[PDB]
Design a protein around this ligand. Structure first.
Ligand SMILES: NC(=S)c1cc(=O)[nH]c(=O)n1[C@@H]1O[C@H](COP(=O)(O)O)[C@@H](O)[C@H]1O
Ligand SMILES: NC(=S)c1cc(=O)[nH]c(=O)n1[C@@H]1O[C@H](COP(=O)(O)O)[C@@H](O)[C@H]1O
Ligand code: PRO
Ligand code: PRO
Lengths: 256, 256
């Protein structure tokens, strides 16, 4: 097993994965903030204050009540200042012809500001081929949803294996996974894991939580994605630091 | 097998399904236009001209370059005038807590104007439970994606069976499926089938086409969803009429 800094230099590394792995190693963070907020001001205040603690900020542009492209300009300024990537959690999930238009166009112009997006693999590889027609010219990357954290997830067994094959066959654009565990044996791929809290439990709508130690240390993932464990806390900076230190130490201990 | 008009009266029918089945029978149309356009003016001009020919207009609000809620007000006026439902093809596809916010909120306020939305079943039943917390109070309906038209689709076998079970267990909100065929034996559920053209073929990004006769007549679906077969034609009204007559006669012949 290689450090994040060494993985950043692998021959087959994607440039977006390399940038991410280098800033993870530099900043000692493998935390992705899930900024599930409805106000641009709260999104930007979280990005500014927590930027030093995170490798990545995951957005849901479609729940911002006051989305504009200027908000995303201000977010990019903070991402460059504090050195983190922007990941729009769009879950592209249809035929290639449709997702190509959804990625480039409409009011959000996601490809113009998102370093990373994700896709469900259920439509077959056309979902990746369509996105890559927009994303490759713009030097973007994509994550494939290989496993899900929620009760009754169908992203298991042969579905997960199909996601891994699709990623490994589209390595010029696919840089990793949303997963609960290491699913690819190839170190060039990032594993990002949502469904993470320090305390045991879940929510009222099928979310299930595992700890940073469990998902980074035992399950071999690279990055934790944390929403409410941070966002609902009073001091979101302290909460982000607790999650960062948990995920980072779990990574160091596994690396040995 | 019951006519659309008789299915509209079934004891367990959802009110949105009943409204749809009644206007299908009244207008002799089982055609859903896939209005995959980037200009509000083109969306509204298609909705006005093709409204009499369609039971439903399927939107992708996120590819409209000039989306506003006023555009959706104008679309509702046309839907009421010409009697068709509005189906936003949002493909909700995450944990219940997230999709609840995506359905109600952000710039699109989808629940405020969409009679129908759809969801992928990959997250497990929490995707339906989250959407229904917004959709049930607003008397809306949902379609579950049980099969997909594209090459390499993973919506097969046990995945399709899980979608059918999830629909049948959430009948207060789920009114049917996106599928290639009849997948539920319960006549209260609608089957809507995309990947439809009069001519054989596909696209360059994994879309595959079957004819209205094949999917309504042989595969037992209720409604065809047609995009480019209409949208790319010079005379979109004539094209819509050809697809309407094809789907309607296939339905009549199967009913006997
Ligand atoms: N789309 C992805 S990254 C995803 C996949 C998954 O399996 N489980 C997921 O919780 N997520 C997302 O991660 C976030 C988890 O938030 P929280 O439960 O920590 O508050 C949320 O935005 C959800 O949409
Ligand atoms: N999301 C759904 S309804 C879907 C599921 C599926 O399996 N195949 C799909 O083509 N669709 C959608 O139907 C439309 C087909 O357009 P066309 O190929 O007729 O031009 C398009 O908007 C696509 O996103
Ligand atoms: O010097 C560095 O940071 C990188 C890490 C692995 C080797 N070179
Ligand atoms: O009269 C009608 O239109 C409906 C159709 C089935 C029975 N009643």
């Amino acid at each position: 097993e290689l450090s994040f800094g060494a993985r950043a230099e692998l021959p087959r590394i994607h440039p977006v994965a390399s940038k991410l792995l280098r800033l993870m190693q530099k900043k000692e963070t493998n935390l992705c903030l899930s900024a599930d907020v409805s106000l641009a001001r709260e999104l930007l205040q979280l990005a500014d204050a927590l930027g030093p603690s995170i490798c990545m900020l995951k957005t849901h542009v479609d729940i911002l009540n006051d989305f504009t492209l200027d908000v995303m300009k201000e977010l990019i300024t903070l991402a460059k200042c504090h050195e983190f990537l922007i990941f729009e959690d769009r879950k592209f999930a249809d035929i290639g012809n449709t997702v190509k238009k959804q990625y480039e166009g409409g009011i959000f112009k996601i490809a113009s500001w998102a370093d990373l997006v994700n896709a469900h693999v259920v439509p077959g590889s056309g979902v990746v081929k369509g996105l890559q027609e927009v994303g490759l010219p713009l030097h973007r990357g994509c994550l494939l949803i290989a496993e899900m954290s929620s009760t009754g997830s169908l992203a298991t067994g042969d579905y997960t294996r199909a996601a891994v094959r699709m990623a490994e066959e589209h390595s010029e654009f696919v840089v990793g996974f949303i997963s609960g565990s290491r699913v690819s044996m190839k170190p060039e791929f990032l594993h990002l894991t949502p469904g993470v809290q320090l305390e045991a439990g879940g929510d009222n709508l099928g979310q299930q939580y595992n700890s940073p130690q469990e998902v980074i240390g035992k399950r071999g993932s690279d990055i934790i994605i944390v929403g409410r464990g941070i966002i609902s806390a009073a001091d979101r900076l302290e909460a982000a630091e607790m999650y960062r230190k948990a995920a980072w130490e779990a990574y160091l201990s596994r690396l040995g």
